[PDB]
Amino acid sequence: GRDIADTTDAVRDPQTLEILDITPCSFGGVSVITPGTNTSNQVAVLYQGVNCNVFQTRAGCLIGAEHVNNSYECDIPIGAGICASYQTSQSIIAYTMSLGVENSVAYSNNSIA
Amino acid sequence: IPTNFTISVTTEILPVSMTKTSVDCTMYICGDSTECSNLLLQYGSFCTQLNRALTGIAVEQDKNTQEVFAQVKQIYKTPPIKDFGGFNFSQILPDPSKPSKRSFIEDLLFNKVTFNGLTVLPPLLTDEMIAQYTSALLAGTITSGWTFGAGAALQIPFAMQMAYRFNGIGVTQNVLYENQKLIANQFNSAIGKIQDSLSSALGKLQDVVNQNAQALNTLVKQLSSNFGAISSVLNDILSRLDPPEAEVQIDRLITGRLQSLQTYVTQQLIRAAEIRASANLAATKMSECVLGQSKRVDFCGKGYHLMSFPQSAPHGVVFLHVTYVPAQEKNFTTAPAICHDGKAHFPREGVFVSNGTHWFVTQRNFYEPQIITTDNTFVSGNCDVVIGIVNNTVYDPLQPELD
Amino acid sequence: TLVKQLSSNFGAISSVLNDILSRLDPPEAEVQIDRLITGRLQSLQTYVTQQLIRAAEIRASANLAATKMSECVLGQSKRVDFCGKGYHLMSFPQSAPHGVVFLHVTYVPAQEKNFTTAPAICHDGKAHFPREGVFVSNGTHWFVTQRNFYEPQIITTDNTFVSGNCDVVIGIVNNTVYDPLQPELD
Ligand SMILES: *[C@@H]1O[C@H](CO)[C@@H](O)[C@H](O)[C@H]1NC(C)=O
Ligand SMILES: *[C@@H]1O[C@H](CO)[C@@H](O)[C@H](O)[C@H]1NC(C)=O
Ligand SMILES: *[C@@H]1O[C@H](CO)[C@@H](O)[C@H](O)[C@H]1NC(C)=O
Ligand SMILES: *[C@@H]1O[C@H](CO)[C@@H](O)[C@H](O)[C@H]1NC(C)=O
Ligand SMILES: *[C@@H]1O[C@H](CO)[C@@H](O)[C@H](O)[C@H]1NC(C)=O
Ligand SMILES: *[C@@H]1O[C@H](CO)[C@@H](O)[C@H](O)[C@H]1NC(C)=O
Ligand SMILES: *[C@@H]1O[C@H](CO)[C@@H](O)[C@H](O)[C@H]1NC(C)=O
Ligand SMILES: *[C@@H]1O[C@H](CO)[C@@H](O)[C@H](O)[C@H]1NC(C)=O
C-alpha cells in the first residue's frame, strides 16, 4: 500500500491475507513552562500532539497545572487559546484566554454623548 | 457638476498568517537508525539553528494575527434593537442561531476556501476568538462611530453619523437628510449584490495554502531520493554491506537530506518575510480605514470613502469598503468672480455657475443651485486685475428691511 | 554559532589545520582539506543568507521610522493611530542606541454626559441645519455645541443655514430660533 506521500501505509499479511494499516506511533515534542528562576522553581511540562494532576488540552497533553473556571489575560501562551501563569501556596494554573472586559453601549434613536 | 450619486461596496482580501511548522531533524535525516545519529554528530548545532529559525517564524506568525485584530480593549455588544434608520445589517452581523458565532458572510467565505519528523502547531487564537474580535469591532463602528477608536465609546444615532461622514467628503448634510430612503435602499441592494457575487472571487488566500502544501509534499517526496548513492533505504545499506563501506553511502544520504532541509527552511523564511509585509499593510488598513474616515485617495477603495466593515476569513481578513461616486453631470458655464460695483466678489465655498440666463453659486460635488448673496461671498481686490469677470448684480439682505 | 562551527571535524581527522598539515604528507593532505573546506563554506553561506534577510527586515523598519519622523514631527498628522493613540497634537523625537524613540503627545476626552438630540429644527416652516455643531437639548431648551467639547450656545441665524422644507426630513422638532436682527430693529 501507499499514500500520496510515497510511503508505505498498508500491508497485507502473507500468512493469512488480511489488511493491516501502519500509523506512526507517539511522535511529538516536549516543552517546559516556567515563571522565572528569580521567583520560583516549580515548572510544568507540556507534550504537544500526544493523547495521554493531568489536564487535557487541544494543544496536546499538559502535566503540572490544574484547570480553573476563572478567566484572565494571557501571561504565558500555550496554544489554542490556553495560557498559564504563576500567581494563584502558589502553583502554576492553566486558564482559558479571555479577551477584554464586556461592555454595552446604550444606543437609542435620539441619544448622544 | 454632478447631480446624482450611488453607493457601492467592494471587497478586499489581505492574507495575514501562514501555517506554523516545526521539524525534528534527527527523525528526518536518520530516522530510527543508531549509527546514523552517531555519524551525524560531526556537524553539530545545525539542528539548533534550524529549530531556532522555525520557532522564530512561528512566533512571528502568531504575532501578526495578534496585531491585526486586537485593536480595542473593550468587547462591545450589539444592542437588541435592530432599528438603524433603514439600514439592514442582518447579513454581516453575528447570528446567534449558528453553533459558532460567525455571520453569514463569514460562513460563506469559510466554505469557499478549501508524518515523518514533521509537526504542525495550532494557532494561539482560535476561530471563535477572531470572530468575537470582528463582532466587537463591527458593533463599535455601528453604534459609536469613530469615538471608540480614541478613548471611551460615545453613542450617536446612525443617521447623524452618516451626515457627519458626508460632511467629510465635502457635501452638506441636507443632501443626506433629504434623501435618506434612497441611500438606505442603495446600500442594502449593494450588500445583497455582493453577497450573491461571493456565492460564485478569491485567489490570494488559496495561494498560501497551496504553496505550503506543495513545499511539504516536495520535502516528503525528496525523502526517497538516492542522492547518488546505491540505495535509498538505510536498512538495506546497513544490513547488506560491510560497515566500513556503508559509511560512504550514509554520508551521501545525510549530506543530501541536510541540503534539502536547508533549502526548505530558506524558502519558508523568504515567504514569511512577504507574509509579514502583507500583515503590516493589513494592520494599517484596519487601523485607518475602519476606525475613522480616510482622506487618502484610493487607499481604502475606489471613490470617496465612507466606512468599512472587517470580516474574518481563513488565514486572512476580508474587508467591505463603502464608497461614494458621482453619477450624472450636466454642462454649465462658469466664471471666476463677479464685478458688482467695481469690486470683485470671490465665492466663499462653492463655485459660480450659470443656467445660461442668470448666475448661481453651488457646492462642487452636488448640484444645489443657490441665489447669490453677500453672505455666501466675500469682497477683495479690484475689478481690473482679474483675468476673467462677468457683470451681474449682487443681492444684499440688509436692503429689504430698510422700510 | 559561526565561531562555534570551527570545532567540528566534518568527518576529517581533526578540526585544526596545523595538526593535519604536520601529520600527513601533501598527497594525502587534500582528502581532509576539501572535507573541511566544504563544511566551512556551507557555514559561511548560511551566515550570509541569514544576515541578508535580517538586514532586509531592518531596512523595512528603518523606512517606517523615517516616514513616522517625517509625518508626526514636522507637522500635525490627521491619520488615526499612526501618530500615537487618540487625537494627535505633536511628537518629540529622542535618540537611543541603534534605535529611535518618539513621544507622541495625544488628546483624549474624559467625561461624557447623557443628552437628547434631534437632526434638525423646524422654526417657521423652514428647516434649519447647524453649520458646524450639533443640536442638543437639556430637556427644557435646545442648544448648539461643537462636537468634541461641551459648550452650549443659543440657536441663531448665524449658526444654522436654511434649506429645504419641513416635510422631507425624518427627525425634526419644533423650537423658536433667536433672530439677532430683531433687537436691531429698535
Ligand atoms: C484519546 O484517546 C481516547 C481513547 O478512546 C479517546 O476517547 C479520546 O477522545 C482521545 N483524545 C484525543 C484528544 O485524541
Ligand atoms: C426611534 O426608534 C424608536 C424605536 O423604539 C421609535 O419608537 C421612535 O419613534 C423612533 N423615533 C424617531 C424620531 O425615529
Ligand atoms: C438618482 O438616481 C435614482 C436611481 O433610480 C433616481 O431614483 C433618482 O431620482 C435620481 N436623482 C434625481 C435627483 O433624480
Ligand atoms: C433585513 O434583510 C433580511 C434579508 O432578507 C430580512 O430578512 C429582514 O427582514 C430585513 N430587516 C428589516 C428590518 O427589514
Ligand atoms: C476663453 O477662450 C476664448 C477663445 O478665444 C477667448 O476668446 C476668451 O478671451 C477666453 N477667456 C478667458 C477668460 O481666458
Ligand atoms: C461691466 O460693467 C462695466 C461698467 O458699466 C463695463 O465697463 C464693462 O464693459 C462691463 N463688462 C462687460 C464684460 O461688458
Ligand atoms: C439618559 O437619560 C434618559 C432619560 O433622561 C434615560 O432614559 C437613560 O437611561 C439615560 N441613559 C443612561 C445610560 O442611563
Ligand atoms: C410643529 O408645529 C406644526 C404646526 O402646527 C405641527 O403640525 C407639528 O405637529 C409640530 N411638531 C411637533 C409638535 O412635534
PDB file of C-alpha atoms in Angstrom, chain B residues 41-46 49 52-53 60 71 73 146-147 149-154 157 160 164 167 172-174 177-178 180-181 259 262 265-266 269-270 272-273 276 284 287-288 291-293 296 299 368 370 375 398 401, chain C residues 1 4-5 7-12 42 46-47 49-50 53-54 57 78-82 85-87 107-110 112 117-120 129-135 147 161-165 168-171 181 185:
ATOM      1  CA  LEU B  41      27.184  14.308  15.296  1.00  0.00           C
ATOM      2  CA  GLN B  42      30.140  15.562  13.230  1.00  0.00           C
ATOM      3  CA  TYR B  43      28.466  18.755  12.004  1.00  0.00           C
ATOM      4  CA  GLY B  44      26.773  19.998  15.168  1.00  0.00           C
ATOM      5  CA  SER B  45      24.450  22.900  16.011  1.00  0.00           C
ATOM      6  CA  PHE B  46      22.709  22.713  12.627  1.00  0.00           C
ATOM      7  CA  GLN B  49      19.966  26.643  14.159  1.00  0.00           C
ATOM      8  CA  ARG B  52      15.540  28.393  16.159  1.00  0.00           C
ATOM      9  CA  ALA B  53      14.692  29.729  12.701  1.00  0.00           C
ATOM     10  CA  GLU B  60       6.189  35.997  14.145  1.00  0.00           C
ATOM     11  CA  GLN B  71      -7.132  46.991  18.368  1.00  0.00           C
ATOM     12  CA  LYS B  73      -9.538  46.697  24.702  1.00  0.00           C
ATOM     13  CA  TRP B 146     -15.173  56.731  15.338  1.00  0.00           C
ATOM     14  CA  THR B 147     -15.242  57.753  19.010  1.00  0.00           C
ATOM     15  CA  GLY B 149     -11.207  54.325  18.276  1.00  0.00           C
ATOM     16  CA  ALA B 150      -9.862  57.013  20.629  1.00  0.00           C
ATOM     17  CA  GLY B 151     -10.922  56.686  24.258  1.00  0.00           C
ATOM     18  CA  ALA B 152     -14.254  55.657  25.700  1.00  0.00           C
ATOM     19  CA  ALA B 153     -17.037  54.927  23.229  1.00  0.00           C
ATOM     20  CA  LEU B 154     -19.742  57.558  22.726  1.00  0.00           C
ATOM     21  CA  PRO B 157     -27.607  57.867  16.145  1.00  0.00           C
ATOM     22  CA  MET B 160     -26.239  61.748  12.329  1.00  0.00           C
ATOM     23  CA  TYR B 164     -21.060  63.706   9.578  1.00  0.00           C
ATOM     24  CA  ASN B 167     -19.504  66.352   5.690  1.00  0.00           C
ATOM     25  CA  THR B 172     -23.681  69.469   3.141  1.00  0.00           C
ATOM     26  CA  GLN B 173     -25.925  67.480   5.461  1.00  0.00           C
ATOM     27  CA  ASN B 174     -29.137  68.349   3.607  1.00  0.00           C
ATOM     28  CA  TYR B 177     -31.321  64.353   5.359  1.00  0.00           C
ATOM     29  CA  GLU B 178     -33.446  64.850   2.226  1.00  0.00           C
ATOM     30  CA  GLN B 180     -32.246  59.076   3.362  1.00  0.00           C
ATOM     31  CA  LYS B 181     -34.551  56.374   1.975  1.00  0.00           C
ATOM     32  CA  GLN B 259      20.945  20.285   1.882  1.00  0.00           C
ATOM     33  CA  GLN B 262      18.375  23.929   4.272  1.00  0.00           C
ATOM     34  CA  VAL B 265      13.984  26.458   5.607  1.00  0.00           C
ATOM     35  CA  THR B 266      15.322  29.218   3.349  1.00  0.00           C
ATOM     36  CA  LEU B 269      11.796  32.197   5.742  1.00  0.00           C
ATOM     37  CA  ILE B 270      11.689  34.104   2.444  1.00  0.00           C
ATOM     38  CA  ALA B 272       7.376  34.510   5.838  1.00  0.00           C
ATOM     39  CA  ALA B 273       9.020  37.875   5.170  1.00  0.00           C
ATOM     40  CA  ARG B 276       4.860  39.821   7.444  1.00  0.00           C
ATOM     41  CA  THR B 284      -2.500  49.695   8.756  1.00  0.00           C
ATOM     42  CA  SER B 287      -6.400  50.896  11.919  1.00  0.00           C
ATOM     43  CA  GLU B 288      -7.041  53.714   9.452  1.00  0.00           C
ATOM     44  CA  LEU B 291     -11.554  53.334  12.972  1.00  0.00           C
ATOM     45  CA  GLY B 292     -12.315  56.595  11.215  1.00  0.00           C
ATOM     46  CA  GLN B 293     -12.746  58.161   7.795  1.00  0.00           C
ATOM     47  CA  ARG B 296      -6.192  59.198   1.307  1.00  0.00           C
ATOM     48  CA  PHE B 299      -6.183  53.738  -0.162  1.00  0.00           C
ATOM     49  CA  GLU B 368     -27.552  72.523  -5.428  1.00  0.00           C
ATOM     50  CA  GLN B 370     -28.375  78.834  -4.649  1.00  0.00           C
ATOM     51  CA  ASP B 375     -23.449  86.197   2.910  1.00  0.00           C
ATOM     52  CA  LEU B 398     -29.952  94.354   4.501  1.00  0.00           C
ATOM     53  CA  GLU B 401     -35.566  95.768   5.873  1.00  0.00           C
TER      54      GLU B 401
ATOM     55  CA  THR C   1      27.240  29.880  16.271  1.00  0.00           C
ATOM     56  CA  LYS C   4      31.463  27.502  17.335  1.00  0.00           C
ATOM     57  CA  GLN C   5      31.224  25.899  13.885  1.00  0.00           C
ATOM     58  CA  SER C   7      35.463  22.816  16.213  1.00  0.00           C
ATOM     59  CA  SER C   8      33.553  20.327  14.029  1.00  0.00           C
ATOM     60  CA  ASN C   9      35.721  17.708  12.332  1.00  0.00           C
ATOM     61  CA  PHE C  10      33.279  17.464   9.384  1.00  0.00           C
ATOM     62  CA  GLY C  11      34.348  13.834   9.002  1.00  0.00           C
ATOM     63  CA  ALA C  12      38.043  14.671   8.638  1.00  0.00           C
ATOM     64  CA  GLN C  42      28.461  25.931   3.879  1.00  0.00           C
ATOM     65  CA  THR C  46      24.227  30.080   5.864  1.00  0.00           C
ATOM     66  CA  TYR C  47      25.505  33.040   7.879  1.00  0.00           C
ATOM     67  CA  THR C  49      21.924  34.412   3.918  1.00  0.00           C
ATOM     68  CA  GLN C  50      20.626  34.938   7.451  1.00  0.00           C
ATOM     69  CA  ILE C  53      17.299  38.570   5.389  1.00  0.00           C
ATOM     70  CA  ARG C  54      17.708  40.287   8.763  1.00  0.00           C
ATOM     71  CA  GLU C  57      13.721  43.407   7.726  1.00  0.00           C
ATOM     72  CA  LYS C  78      -4.648  63.502  10.664  1.00  0.00           C
ATOM     73  CA  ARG C  79      -4.194  59.736  10.285  1.00  0.00           C
ATOM     74  CA  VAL C  80      -5.785  57.676  13.050  1.00  0.00           C
ATOM     75  CA  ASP C  81      -3.463  55.689  15.349  1.00  0.00           C
ATOM     76  CA  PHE C  82      -0.487  56.378  13.077  1.00  0.00           C
ATOM     77  CA  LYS C  85      -3.163  56.708  20.312  1.00  0.00           C
ATOM     78  CA  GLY C  86      -6.038  59.171  20.160  1.00  0.00           C
ATOM     79  CA  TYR C  87      -6.086  62.564  18.527  1.00  0.00           C
ATOM     80  CA  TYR C 107      -5.553  64.268  23.253  1.00  0.00           C
ATOM     81  CA  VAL C 108      -8.371  62.156  24.691  1.00  0.00           C
ATOM     82  CA  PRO C 109     -11.843  63.080  26.010  1.00  0.00           C
ATOM     83  CA  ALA C 110     -12.617  62.202  29.617  1.00  0.00           C
ATOM     84  CA  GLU C 112     -19.289  62.463  28.775  1.00  0.00           C
ATOM     85  CA  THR C 117     -30.580  65.244  20.208  1.00  0.00           C
ATOM     86  CA  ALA C 118     -32.624  65.936  17.093  1.00  0.00           C
ATOM     87  CA  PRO C 119     -31.373  66.029  13.487  1.00  0.00           C
ATOM     88  CA  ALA C 120     -32.834  69.432  12.595  1.00  0.00           C
ATOM     89  CA  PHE C 129     -29.391  72.697   9.888  1.00  0.00           C
ATOM     90  CA  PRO C 130     -26.343  73.502  12.040  1.00  0.00           C
ATOM     91  CA  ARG C 131     -23.271  74.738  10.204  1.00  0.00           C
ATOM     92  CA  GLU C 132     -20.691  73.024  12.398  1.00  0.00           C
ATOM     93  CA  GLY C 133     -22.229  71.995  15.718  1.00  0.00           C
ATOM     94  CA  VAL C 134     -24.960  69.533  16.607  1.00  0.00           C
ATOM     95  CA  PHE C 135     -28.365  70.260  18.117  1.00  0.00           C
ATOM     96  CA  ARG C 147     -18.887  68.098  18.663  1.00  0.00           C
ATOM     97  CA  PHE C 161     -28.448  77.722   7.452  1.00  0.00           C
ATOM     98  CA  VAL C 162     -31.933  77.398   5.979  1.00  0.00           C
ATOM     99  CA  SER C 163     -32.557  74.756   3.323  1.00  0.00           C
ATOM    100  CA  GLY C 164     -35.435  72.555   2.236  1.00  0.00           C
ATOM    101  CA  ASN C 165     -38.879  72.164   3.768  1.00  0.00           C
ATOM    102  CA  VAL C 168     -38.866  65.698   3.746  1.00  0.00           C
ATOM    103  CA  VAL C 169     -36.693  65.094   6.819  1.00  0.00           C
ATOM    104  CA  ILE C 170     -37.337  62.276   9.286  1.00  0.00           C
ATOM    105  CA  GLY C 171     -36.073  63.639  12.589  1.00  0.00           C
ATOM    106  CA  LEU C 181     -31.759  91.165  13.582  1.00  0.00           C
ATOM    107  CA  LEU C 185     -34.972  96.945  14.752  1.00  0.00           C
TER     108      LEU C 185
END
